[PDB]
């Protein structure tokens, strides 16, 4: 599988266009570069190729742009670059450029836009496990957890679901998860389980059910007894699933 | 002295509280200042049972042992600005910023849970000023959001922090003539469930009964809450009279339990009061307690069976006339008394005359009586609210408001199954 | 203090909003300079719900006027009511939504949202205890519909537990893309609105046609309603004092929160309570092209104003409920909440406002769905929408969603036991 370059294939006016006040310039600029290049890419070259600017641009669009179409495009491109560059190519320097913007823009509801954001988030987390036993990606873990306390209920849902995915897909130990457990994870999980909206309480039930499946039904017994009898029974029921 | 702390929750509890403490203050010769009326030296009640409800500061002022709690400042601001603004210490009146919006869930799980810290604190502060705290009087509505949600929440905590202390509940049962919400049957069933184990004695007050009493007896074509509360305060005053003055029965919050409840769950006495007359004899008022139009709950006392009874007389009363009146009820036979009740009716007299406030429509009477009877006919109150509950819940109407406020939908079922059990337990114990 | 933040979006929303503010100004005894000249205390009590006390003693509306085009906002500027409006509460772009939902929701409107959001954030900071928002707009246009529903969603993201009331004007067959804009907005309202007052522009026209009316004549009618609708919110008080208490009482199910509204008296000598009541429930007095008799009342919030006895009103409302018992569902005890307020409108003795959650409102949606499907099957005008960032499945979503709404309203129409 040959490796390609993409930085020498940008539109010569990309910088002026992408930074244009006209939405159409930004959308066309992204869509063009995607169709003519990123879409037809199978492998990338990390050698003597710096993606910082490009990813920084994307990351900026994802976080602050109002046109959700351009947001969906940037997230799709970031996901393309990351999956086709893999590791150690896509460095933590690149992760820090696009991870927080994506976590911030999980507020979106539009199916195609949030799907792009989820894919990007899952692809980066795939190559960088937030719960790594090395404890190298704890910064991302703090990021997810801090977002699971966000004022916006949509972000709490999307990030807690992302957190659950990290727990489920973890297959290399749970040492990083144990440290943040009683002092960070459980206090946040309890807030989710006790949320006003039932759609969010359900996600909480799943989280506690997973924590129970891992660390055992016993180690939380003092915590569970404080919940509502029905919230406790819900988790008890979810654990079976 | 054996102090009694009076807690009021929600608009109904607080407005009834205003009518009660206005009357209490008059019956003990205390002005809205907290000071004694001109030329009194000491308040009328004590030295005896006056200290039970009031606190003597030391500089000539008397303060009600009361706590007002609401999740909106509106009702309590009327107290803070009214003529009785100085009666209660400002710390005794607690208000939030946003109410429970006719929703038991945000009174129990959401907003009512924000103020809970403050309330329990003031209660502890008031309880620490007591040489021998006797218990609590809990006054609230079961139809509101704060009365129901924060109320039951408060009873739950009170049972925890004060396990050895008794709690008498005054619950305002909802009526359609003066309803403020469509989901009142939901709140009522939920409150009954979560307070069925955190109350030693519960005195139900059907607003439909009080409304009809004001309409029939006092001849008011459309009674306001003020009319209702004036009558209610007259009843509550009569009940607490033995505690606040010299009585021979129910002179203790614990004697209500002892004399009325056989089993813990069966703690819902039917209250009767007589006479109820507008400004415009013992035998007669005693017989009136056993007739349909003199109860605090819409029902026919002639139906169902009596399990226990406490006739509390007030004012100009001589033991001969009451001994006659009581045996008159037994002998000619309104019994209708369960075969397993040993001693039948218990009598109590408080020679202090009953009082009516000038700013009301009630006539001052020489003597009055109040009967507290644990009868099965009160199950009608739960049956009527049960049909209301079932009709709506069969379609899960308005439930998304509760489930959307942190409550699990299962509690609707558990609460309804519990009330169905309470109904069965009542018709079953009358057997 | 339970403040409410008003938002006027679009030409319609800004002209109806203006008429509204201009109306309630008088009922609270306020000059158009903000100074209070009322002769009652009731007018001053719940005054801070809609108005902000400027240090000068004057009272300024808590209104935010938003329009992608500077046209109508400039008309409101140099108007009578334009004097007490806060200058920096005027938000406006240079472009226009061109009467297409897409330009308001994704494109040009999406670029102006953050500028208005700053102002509502500043307003919300100056609230003792903000209860919610109220929005005036047309569902037929591009700005009011598209940007309005965008603003609603973005408002809920930042204020999740604050109430969301909406005054939405539905278009009548009388500008060829209104079924598109309307259906796409209804899909947003059902998801992100707590309370929606449906003001069919056909019903307003029909009623004014009092003996062809202009938009101004329609606006007075709308303004009169909104004044009546918000009587519980602006005066103390017992029934439905909050937007929240009202929602709990009017909304049995989450996506059934679209209310019909009736008002009386209209006409062109003084009325009796029975006449005021019978006129109110009349189909000729409904502000929506739909006969309530073709459906059932799930809930009702009747508001009476002026010199009337509480008893006479309750006795009459009860009599109507008993007589017309078939037009009320039996599985909701005490559907109808009846309130009374001493403060009358101006210049009237007494008046009655009628908020209903009737199932017959399905006729409104069912009508638009037919016009929507008529165009959509031909794929008409789609270019003007998909060129902005929309997809066809978004149209099909809104269509089938509004279809489910009709099915739902119809489902409880027939509910038994
Ligand atoms: N007897 C009597 N009943 C009242 C009074 N005020 C309200 N109620 C009843 O109480 C029920 C509603 O509850 P609220 O009194 O508003 O109590 P709340 O907890 O403050 O209700 P929220 O608005 O949710 O805070 C209604 O069914 C009324 O019939 C009153 O002053 N006297
Ligand atoms: N009742 C009433 N309806 C109005 C009024 N003005 C506009 N409309 C309705 O609004 C619909 C179109 O939206 P508009 O309010 O005109 O304008 P917009 O929604 O802001 O869209 P833009 O053109 O981008 O500004 C029309 O179908 C009208 O029926 C009004 O003053 N009163
Ligand atoms: Mg209240
Ligand atoms: Mg316009």
Numbering used by the authors:
A (entry chain C): 319 to 559
B (entry chain A): 1 to 280, 288 to 438
C (entry chain B): 1 to 174, 178 to 212, 215 to 216, 219 to 275, 282 to 430
From the manuscript:
A recent study from our group revealed that the TOG1 domain from Stu2p binds preferentially to a ‘curved’ conformation of αβ-tubulin that cannot be incorporated into the body of the microtubule.
We solved the crystal structure of a TOG2:αβ-tubulin complex to resolve this ambiguity. The structure was determined by molecular replacement from crystals that diffracted anisotropically to a minimum Bragg spacing of 2.8 Å. Conserved residues like W341 and R519 on the tubulin-binding surface of TOG2 make very similar contacts with αβ-tubulin as their equivalents in TOG1 (W23 and R200, respectively). The structure of TOG2 bound to αβ-tubulin superimposes with the structure of ‘free’ TOG2 with 0.7 Å rmsd over 237 Cα atoms. Thus, both TOG1 and TOG2 bind preferentially to the same, curved conformation of αβ-tubulin.
